[PDB]
Amino acid sequence: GVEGEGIWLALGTIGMLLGMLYFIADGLDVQDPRQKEFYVITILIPAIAAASYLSMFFGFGLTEVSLANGRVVDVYWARYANWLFTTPLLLLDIGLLAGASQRDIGALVGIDAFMIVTGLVATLTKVVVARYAFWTISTISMVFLLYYLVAVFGEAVSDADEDTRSTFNALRNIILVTWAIYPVAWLVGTEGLALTGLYGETLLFMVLDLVAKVGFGFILLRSRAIM
């Protein structure tokens, strides 16, 4: 544990609200249907995240887990429900942009669900070796996620014009750079090796989420590529 983390839950919440509020204000002049499909998907992401963050702020979706070890971890489980719904949407979004087939997006969200699910079990087990084991398999599968991202979506976008290739790189980079830190944050946070407390791990996830979501969706929506 180590409380006071709710300040990150509050600022996280409102950043989502603001990002979501902005995308609406910006998607007001929108015209082509496909562009509109992008706006629903993008605005859907911090929406869900904000509801998730609001529940955590009000203390819902918290849960204590006494480890075999003896230690007890306060674990925010709403977080993993958040990720369950939100990550297949960022994948869909970048996927649509890349012009990847639903077969390919679907295969990528298939391994995303496994990653977030096994991450959830690692967070919740009492047996501490199994925490680290399910952590290992989760990040293994995140590496295949990242591989098929750069290669399957990458190959789909190679036929596309310069600006949807440059937009897709900008988004591919964000995912690579920011999704890769999530499992290290789990590791050094209280859920893993506990180098930081609950307060600093929370801070970390909050920052990562805002750029995975508002930063990401900002770049997508604001782009000559989608009109």
Ligand SMILES: *C/C=C(C)/C=C/C=C(C)/C=C/C1=C(C)CCCC1(C)C
């Ligand atoms: C907006 C939320 C996002 C982009 C969440 C991304 C989540 C991950 C990249 C999760 C990674 C994890 C592992 C690779 C295993 C260790 C535990 C997890 C769930 C943190």
